[PDB]
Write a protein that binds this ligand. Sequence first.
Ligand SMILES: CCCCCCCCN(C)C(=O)c1cc(O)c(O)c(O)c1
Lengths: 231, 226
Amino acid sequence: ANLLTSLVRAHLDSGPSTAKLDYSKFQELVLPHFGKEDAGDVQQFYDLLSGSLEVIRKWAEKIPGFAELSPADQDLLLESAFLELFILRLAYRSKPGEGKLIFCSGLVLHRLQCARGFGDWIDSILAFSRSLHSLLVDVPAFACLSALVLITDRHGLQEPRRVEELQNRIASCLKEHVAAVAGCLSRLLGKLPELRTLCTQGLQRIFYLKLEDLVPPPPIIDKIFMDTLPF
Amino acid sequence: PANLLTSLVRAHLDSGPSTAKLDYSKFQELVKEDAGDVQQFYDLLSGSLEVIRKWAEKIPGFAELSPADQDLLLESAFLELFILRLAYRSKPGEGKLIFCSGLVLHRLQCARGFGDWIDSILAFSRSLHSLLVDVPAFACLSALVLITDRHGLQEPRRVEELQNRIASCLKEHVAAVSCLSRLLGKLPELRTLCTQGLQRIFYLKLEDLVPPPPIIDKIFMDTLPF
Ligand SMILES: CCCCCCCCN(C)C(=O)c1cc(O)c(O)c(O)c1
C-alpha cells in the first residue's frame, strides 16, 4: 500500500543500514566501576537521547498527515512518545545475543560501555530486545506500530479528532499488512507492561542524573522530563 | 560542655522508645507494592517528623539559630536523621527494624514500601553496629548531621560555630575513652543513602498509588537542587 510504503520508507531512513554501522568506539570489554559515573558518561547518555529525538522528529515529519497537525500537537505527541520510541527502536535494532546496543547514529556500544551512563536501565532494555525479537515482528508491522505509539490520544491535543483519524488510517494499514502475510497481536500487547516499566526506569535515571548534576541535561530533554511528570 | 555532652545524651534518650514501650504486636517473624505498603512507608517516615523536631530544640544552641535556619536544617537533615537513628536503633542481625514510636517490624514487612532502600539501610546498620558507637558519641554524631552547612543559611558562621562546639565535645569524649574519622566517615555514607530515599519518593510520586503527605512532599520538593 501507499501509506505502508511511506511508513516503511520513513522507518528505514530513521536508522542505519549494515554498511554504516560505526564500530569506532565499540570495545568488547571495558572494566567499569559499577554504580557510579563521570561527566563523560553522563554527557554521552544525554547526547544519545538528543540524537534519537532529532532523528525521531525527522521520522515523524515523514509520516503522512503528521506535518499538517498544529505545531503544538506535533510537539505534544513527540514529547509524550519520545522515551517509549527511544526504548522500542533501540530494542528492535540492538543485538542482545552479543551484548550490542545499536543507537540510531549507527554507533555500536557494549552493554558494559553503557552501564556507567544508563545504569541498570540498559540491562533491562536488552532484556526487552530479546522479548521483542522472539515475536518476529517484520519491518512493515514495526513501521506501523512505532507510528501508532506516536499518533495516539494525549491530554491537551488541540485537534484530537485529526489525531484519531490518522490513528484509524494507520491501524487499518497494519490490519491490511497482517492479512497480506497471513495469506501475534495479543502477544505484542502482552509486552506493553515491560515497555511502560522501561519508560519509568528512564525517568528514574534522568531524575538520578539531575540530582547528581555532574553535567546539566540538555534543555529539550529536561522539558520532556518535566512535561512528562504527572505532578 | 561537659554539660553539652550531657544535654545531647538527654535529648537522644528522650527522643526514642524506653525498652518497655517497644511494641511487638505487629511483628511477623515469617511472612509489586500496593496502596497499604505506600501508606505504611509514608506513615513510618511521618512518625519521626515531630520526634526529630522536639529532639533538635533540646540541642543547646539550636533554638538560638534564626527560625529560617532551624526549619532549613531540619528539612535538609530529615531523611539522614531518619536513616541514622533507624540504623542505630535496629538489629540488622535479625532484620528487625525498630521505629522511634517503638513499633518493631521485619524487613519483609516494609520491603514493598521502602523498595531496595531498606537493604541499603540495613547494610549501613550492620556497619554502624561494627563501630560499637557509644550513646554519647552517637548523641553528637546525630547533632553533627543536623548542624552542618546547607544552601540558603542566613547565619552560616553561627551554624558552623555550633557544629565546631559539638565536634569539640565529640573529639574530647572519643579521646577521654582513626576511631574519630571512622565515626565522621559515616556522615558522607549517610548522604549517599539520603539520595536513595529521594529516588524512592520520586518513584512513588510517579506510580502515585497514594500521594505523599504534604510535609514529606515539601521536604522532597525543597531538597532537590534544581
Ligand atoms: C510493543 C508494543 C507497542 C506497540 C504499540 C501498541 C499501542 C499503540 N496504540 C494504539 C496506542 O494507542 C498507544 C498505547 C500506549 O499505551 C501508548 O503509550 C502509546 O504511546 C500509544
